[PDB]
Paper text:
While baculovirus and lepidopteran poxin homologs share <25% identity with VACV poxin, they are functional nucleases and retain 2′3′-cGAMP-specific cleavage activity.
Group two primarily contains poxins encoded in alphabaculovirus genomes. The new poxin structures trap a post-reaction state following 2′3′-cGAMP cleavage and allow direct comparison with the catalytic mechanism of VACV poxin. Strikingly, despite sharing <21% identity, each poxin structure contorts 2′3′-cGAMP in an identical strained conformation. Consistent with specificity for 2′3′-cGAMP and a shared mechanism of catalysis, the active-site charge landscape is conserved across all poxin proteins, with hydrophobic pockets for the bases, and multiple basic residues stabilizing the negatively charged phosphates of the 2′3′-cGAMP ligand. Unlike the catalytic triad of histidine, tyrosine, and lysine residues essential for VACV and AcNPV poxin cleavage activity, the active sites of T. ni poxin and PrGV poxin are divergent.
Numbering used by the authors:
A (entry chain A): 0 to 233
B (entry chain B): 1 to 193, 197 to 232
């Protein structure tokens, strides 16, 4: 396999980078698609950050520092972590999510990047390419997943029935499983008790370009409501 | 008294009472950091960390300038350059978030009453709710309101309050416990769901963690910036 800085890597039949070793120690780095749900009990022993199951810790970065990514041309591309991006997956009924530091690339640059391309800070691996989010014409967001950046948020929650993602419509407030006008949500919230017959647990993610809402519910009763920056990677 | 678009008074506890905003009768009730209250009359109003309010405290932008009413009636101009985490519990509802904050010294903090109206563009946008000591002569002043675009807010129903715990140096967090990573990892893979619901907030100077649990089983784990007030 090929060696670069402190890693060894290979390439998938799906044109995806496979991280084989880091610091001369055998490694496991498994990339998940945005919002993908998988079930595989073998994955729970490893670390998880949004979009990756990894045997190696992807360490905390700082916004506005410079990282390097391996390009399809064997070169290193230097990028500044100027934006943020929200990504998630579901692995063994655990919703793993967070807002990640992100770089910005044009159409030409994105296509030179493989899903899995190692990302370096200094000459040490700090992350891998996991996803691309289109932020308009000739512009993409490149999240750098890993341990929560100091100013950001990360987390997980057990979701028995997955994560149902819903487009967040204009003029709607959010309670539990519904988005409705505020005056209605205010009446509904003060109305709801934890008494839904045959109440199943739910997790809902509502999204607009700027903001994400996550609720955790038992039946129609809202247990948690979290508001956080966007955007979401489809 | 009047100032800009508000009318205000003073409490027996030296706390500012907002009486009307835009000539409409107002209700602004300031809660202490982490305070738990129960009063069914509060649930009809808006709630942002540290305040129950009949008026919306709108979204602000970090690094913009706000003005605060001083004890002497003058306006002090401050820049929203920092953040800090605050919360309360009202009617078994944990209301929390990271708020934009200014930095003040001892002399300035002492000129500020809890409840002091905060203005942006000659309009009320918030009230003084809390002070968090940074150092000897340094304080953080949260400006509560609708979540700033880059930060987080939320709520959750907590039947048994919020347990606040100091977060120890080398400990990872699962559910109700903080333990070394190797045990937390095994414990997490151990859990499966007379189990009571729980909410725990572990705090460090830089970072805060909230867990929501059913007995010993962790349902949710949130990591977010600190500090806590
Ligand atoms: N993944 C991750 N994202 C972050 O943003 C982050 N910020 C700090 N840290 C800490 O750095 C070390 C990372 O290894 C840990 O000390 C971790 O502290 P913690 O975040 O306090 O510990 C909870 C552990 O416990 C893990 N688990 C929790 N529940 C489960 C579960 N059901 N199944 C499998 N693992 C579970 C949980 O994912 C996790 O461990 P992992 O790193 O292995 O992911 C982070 N970790
Ligand atoms: N409080 C608050 N903090 C923020 O950071 C924020 N960012 C946007 N918004 C929206 O701005 C308008 C402000 O009113 C609302 O449209 C709100 O949309 P939403 O945040 O999507 O709606 C859920 C409603 O519903 C309220 N409820 C939810 N549960 C309860 C409950 N048990 N009892 C009483 N009220 C409950 C919940 O507090 C809430 O209403 P409040 O405005 O009063 O805060 C925010 N609101």
């Amino acid at each position: 396999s090929m060696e670069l800085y402190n890693i060894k890597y290979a390439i998938d039949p799906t044109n995806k980078i496979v991280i084989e070793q880091v610091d001369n120690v055998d490694a496991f780095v498994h990339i998940l698609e945005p919002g993908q749900e998988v079930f595989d009990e073998t994955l729970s022993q490893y670390h998880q950050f949004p979009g990756v199951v990894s045997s190696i810790i992807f360490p905390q970065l700082v916004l506005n520092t410079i990282i390097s990514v391996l390009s399809e041309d064997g070169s290193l591309l230097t990028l500044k972590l100027e934006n943020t991006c929200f990504n998630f997956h579901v692995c063994n009924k655990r919703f793993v999510f967070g807002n990640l530091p992100a770089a910005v690339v044009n159409n030409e640059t994105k296509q030179k990047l493989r899903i899995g391309a190692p990302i370096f800070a200094g000459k040490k691996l700090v992350s891998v390419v996991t996803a691309f989010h289109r932020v308009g014409e000739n512009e993409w967001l490149l999240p750098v997943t890993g341990i929560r950046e100091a100013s950001q948020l990360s987390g997980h929650m057990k979701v028995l029935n997955g994560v149902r993602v819903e487009k967040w419509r204009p003029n709607m407030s959010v309670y539990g499983t519904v988005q409705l006008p505020y005056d209605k949500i205010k009446q509904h919230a003060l109305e709801q008790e934890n008494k839904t017959p045959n109440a199943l647990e739910s997790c809902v993610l509502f999204y607009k370009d700027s903001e994400i809402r996550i609720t955790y519910n038992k039946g129609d009763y809202e247990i948690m409501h979290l508001r956080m920056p966007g955007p979401l990677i489809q």
